[PDB]
Amino acid sequence: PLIVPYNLPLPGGVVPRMLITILGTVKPNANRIALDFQRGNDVAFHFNPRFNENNRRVIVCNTKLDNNWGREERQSVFPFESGKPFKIQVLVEPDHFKVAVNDAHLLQYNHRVKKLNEISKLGISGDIDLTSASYTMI
Numbered sequence: 001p002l003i004v005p006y007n008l009p010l011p012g013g014v015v016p017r018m019l020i021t022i023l024g025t026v027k028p029n030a031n032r033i034a035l036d037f038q039r040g041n042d043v044a045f046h047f048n049p050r051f052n053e054n055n056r057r058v059i060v061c062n063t064k065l066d067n068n069w070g071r072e073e074r075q076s077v078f079p080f081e082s083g084k085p086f087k088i089q090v091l092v093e094p095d096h097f098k099v100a101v102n103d104a105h106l107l108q109y110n111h112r113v114k115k116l117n118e119i120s121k122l123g124i125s126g127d128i129d130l131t132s133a134s135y136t137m138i
């Protein structure tokens with residue numbers, strides 16, 4: 001019921017205790033999913049499940065500054081499956097984003113962009129049917 005790519009504004013940026021929840025279903029024969037927490041043109045946190053990178057499934061995380069991608073942090077634990085519904089929860093903590101998928105902790109990503117209050121948009125894209133994109137304070 002939501003258009004993809006989807007832009008979710010994050011008013012006044014992010015802050016510790018902010019929980020962002022994305023519900024969707026992976027399409028059959030999916031290639032990629034991307035969450036992009038943006039600070040203007042910069043990407044503070046790119047969370048990028050890849051379903052077929054040299055016949056491997058991997059999650060690539062990174063930051064884009066001044067149009068340049070930085071050093072990739074790769075996670076081989078891969079909780080997504082083509083055709084299946086998922087929940088991604090991103091909890092903002094003082095020193096990292098903490099990601100859980102389907103209620104199971106997946107990874108953390110240390111804050112490289114430090115102006116948390118300027119990370120004011122989340123872009124959601126890729127091979128999914130998007131059901132819900134929302135946030136709350138815990």
Ligand SMILES: OC[C@H]1O[C@@H](O[C@H]2[C@H](O)[C@@H](O)[C@H](O)O[C@@H]2CO)[C@H](O)[C@@H](O)[C@H]1O
Nearest residue numbers: 046048060061062063069070071072073
């Ligand atoms: O780093 C995130 C970024 O990756 C780009 O692709 C990389 C690829 O991961 C790497 O193996 C290769 O050496 O360089 C490519 C270009 O930097 C994606 O194009 C981009 O969308 C992000 O996902």
Ligand SMILES: [Cl-]
Nearest residue numbers: 112113114115
């Ligand atoms: Cl910064």
